[PDB]
Amino acid sequence: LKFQCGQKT
């Protein structure tokens, strides 16, 4: 839904 910089999983 929205981005979370750095999160791959």
Next chain:
Amino acid sequence: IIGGEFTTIENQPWFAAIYRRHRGGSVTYVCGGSLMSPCWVISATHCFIDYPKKEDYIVYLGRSRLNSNTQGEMKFEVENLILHKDYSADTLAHHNDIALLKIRSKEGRCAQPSRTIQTICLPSMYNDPQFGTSCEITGFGKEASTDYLYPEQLKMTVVKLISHRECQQPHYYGSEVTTKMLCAADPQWKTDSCQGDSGGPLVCSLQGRMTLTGIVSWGRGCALKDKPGVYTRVSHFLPWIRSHT
């Protein structure tokens, strides 16, 4: 990348592939880049310097292969191409080698999040990892300096950050490297970035986040002893970035 493993974009969901069109029918790869926000990708000015015609570059997100599609990929046009004023090249180094690309899709939207598209985090003003940190670089560049084609599968590798003191030793790069640059090499000079890897990310972890620490910029040879790869030091450009985003 010399050395490394082959990977898929799920492992670098912020990696962007920039290509150039030759209306003759072909599109060629230019350089790599990283997604900062929904609509902005950052790369390196020397990738665009010789042909700054935005209208001819295409950017893809969620791509694991170089010339074949990957499902989930997004394609965008470059709405804005911002190169750095004060960019310079000498016999080796590139100064102020960072570029911003504003993207827009044919529908008028920016990147959307998925399991193959994520943004990378930026560092805080002049906040870097300490030399010794192991970081990863990724890209579609050469696998050997003598190759004349790029791999078809994305690759990744780990390199360690070295200090400026070490990198400016006369037998390394002397004063060609400045404090707005970072050097990273493999202890055994076995893996490194190379031609075709320009613009892509050097990701390290900072404060608990995977941060875009550097931008693949230049190097003498690839995986050569005492010839580290040099990256632009993103932490020293934070204001410049802010002034345009």
